[PDB]
Each structure stands twice: as C-alpha cells, then as structure tokens.
C-alpha cells in the first residue's frame, strides 16, 4: 500500500534525472510535497511544477531542468536543532555548500541553510543535490 508519498516523489525525480528526462509526472501530490518542490525550486535544482488536480489527491507535471544528482526522503525524519545540522550534512551531502537538506519547521519547510539563518530546527524532510 502507498505509505510514503514524499519518498515516492523524490524517487521518481531521481529516476527521471537518471534517464535525463526533462519532464516527469509526480504521483499523488501533498502539501509537504509542494513545500519541498518550492524550496527545491528556490535552490535552483528543480525547474517547474504544477498541481494538476484529477478529482483525487492530485499530481504534478514537473519540468526537470537538469540540475540535480540524487534526491530521496530522509527516513526517519530526524529531530534536528540549530546546533545539529552539520552531522546530517556530512552524512547525506557530498560537499560543503553543495546540496541542501529539506527541513520541516514550525516557521516553515526549507533547506537547512535558511533554517540555520532562522535559528530554528525541527524534522529533516529530504535531501537534494
């Protein structure tokens, strides 16, 4: 049964990047999916995305502009504080100031650079680079 839509969407984005496809569809869209896509768009790694409702949870027509290398969910969504980002960055990421971790926070969902700027932490959501 479908029980991890954000990880499914990021795995689809990984597959579309690996084949080099410019565009790909996203299986059922969610609000955290849209927040991850918006933060990734502001990172410049992902081009475009539109919620095309289908009388269902809704899907995405995402235009991959060829800027990423791999992106999946962070499982478990680890609790993280302002003084706890660098170890996750050293684990998932490949290099300093290279790629970002999608974070969910009470202020908002955003990459951990802007979360460290906010001085507020929370749960890791995903990673893209």
């Amino acid at each position: 049964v479908l029980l991890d839509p954000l990880a499914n969407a990021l795995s689809t984005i990984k597959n579309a990047e690996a084949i080099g496809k410019s565009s790909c569809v996203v299986r059922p869209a969610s609000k955290n999916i849209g927040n991850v896509l918006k933060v990734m768009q502001d990172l410049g790694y992902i081009g475009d995305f539109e919620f095309i409702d289908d009388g269902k949870a809704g899907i995405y027509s995402v235009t991959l502009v060829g800027r990423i290398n791999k992106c999946g969910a962070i499982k478990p969504r680890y609790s993280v504080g302002t003084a706890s980002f660098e170890r996750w960055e050293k684990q998932f990421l490949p290099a300093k100031n290279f790629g970002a971790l999608i974070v969910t926070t009470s202020s908002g969902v955003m990459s951990q650079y802007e979360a460290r700027d906010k001085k507020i932490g929370g749960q890791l959501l995903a990673y893209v680079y």
Partner: protein, 60 residues
C-alpha cells in the same frame, strides 16, 4: 492530458413503443427496460449493452 476520462459513455435512447425520453447507460449490467410502458431499451452485455431501439444521440 493527466486527468482520467470516462471512455464508457451514456446515450439518449428513445422508446420504440411509448416514445419515452428515457436515459440509459451504455455499459449496462442490467436489462434497462423502459420506465413507463412496455419496452426493454437494451440488454446487459458484459461489455457494451445491445440497444434495441433508437439512440437519439450519444451523450458524454
């Protein structure tokens, strides 16, 4: 597109005896007899129902 559509379609069948302006579903799972007088508008086939009277116009 990205949205799903109903490939199966309705009809506008007209009754052969009482001239009723009844409405039937194309992929009928039941014998859609006429609502009013005496007629069987179409019989339930496993796929598309076999209409016996006039179809005024197939709708969406």
């Amino acid at each position: 597109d990205y949205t799903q559509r109903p490939k199966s379609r309705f009809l506008r069948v007209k009754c052969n005896d009482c001239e009723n302006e009844q409405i039937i579903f194309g992929s009928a799972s039941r014998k859609i007899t006429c609502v009013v007088c005496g007629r069987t508008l179409a019989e339930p086939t496993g796929g598309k129902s076999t209409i016996t009277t006039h179809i005024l116009e197939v709708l969406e």
